[PDB]
Amino acid sequence: STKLEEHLEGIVNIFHQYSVRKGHFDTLSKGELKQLLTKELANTIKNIKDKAVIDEIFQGLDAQVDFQEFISLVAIALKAAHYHTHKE
Amino acid sequence: STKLEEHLEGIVNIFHQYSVRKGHFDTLSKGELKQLLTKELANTIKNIKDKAVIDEIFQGLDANQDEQVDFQEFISLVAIALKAAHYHTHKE
Numbered sequence: 001s002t003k004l005e006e007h008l009e010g011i012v013n014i015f016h017q018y019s020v021r022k023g024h025f026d027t028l029s030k031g032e033l034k035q036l037l038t039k040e041l042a043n044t045i046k047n048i049k050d051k052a053v054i055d056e057i058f059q060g061l062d063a064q065v066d067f068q069e070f071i072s073l074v075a076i077a078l079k080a081a082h083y084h085t086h087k088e
Numbered sequence: 089s090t091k092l093e094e095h096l097e098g099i100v101n102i103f104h105q106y107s108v109r110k111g112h113f114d115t116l117s118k119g120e121l122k123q124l125l126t127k128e129l130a131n132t133i134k135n136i137k138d139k140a141v142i143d144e145i146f147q148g149l150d151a152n153q154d155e156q157v158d159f160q161e162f163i164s165l166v167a168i169a170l171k172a173a174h175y176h177t178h179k180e
């Protein structure tokens with residue numbers, strides 16, 4: 001795998017680390033997802049100064065989740081990560 | 089940074105290693121994005137169907153290859169690649 005592809009695989013690996021733990025191996029409960037995000041994106045979250053974006057990440061977690069839904073969250077975290085790399 | 093965060097930063101880093109090279113420092117042409125797709129995703133995006141998803145997003149990645157693509161658009165490609173990377177783990 002390329003460097004880019006190692007990153008994609010690693011993201012998939014982290015998902016699976018959480019998703020394997022209970023029930024079906026490829027999905028996670030909203031509760032488990034909330035825990036994954038709060039731990040694995042702790043620094044990302046701390047650096048987001050727009051509370052509406054944080055709201056975007058956690059939205060609906062109190063209302064199973066699959067990899068496709070997890071991608072949508074990864075996409076948000078990626079936008080945030082890029083913006084932060086340009087912090088003066 | 090967590091391992092997940094290092095991978096996010098790594099993805100941003102790879103975009104920037106391409107974007108910084110010519111033109112505007114934070115974008116790349118559609119031509120350059122094709123080069124990134126062909127090289128960096130050689131083991132991930134491999135068939136007509138996955139290239140079709142990408143073409144839909146970029147209005148045909150081969151057309152208007154001077155057009156600039158920003159990080160937000162590149163995210164749409166990373167999302168397609170992640171889906172393929174995941175599907176791959178369940179092939180065997």
Ligand code: NA
Nearest residue numbers: 019022024027
């Ligand atoms: Na599970």
Ligand SMILES: [Zn+2]
Nearest residue numbers: 016026174178
């Ligand atoms: Zn899976």
Ligand SMILES: [Zn+2]
Nearest residue numbers: 082104114159
């Ligand atoms: Zn940038």
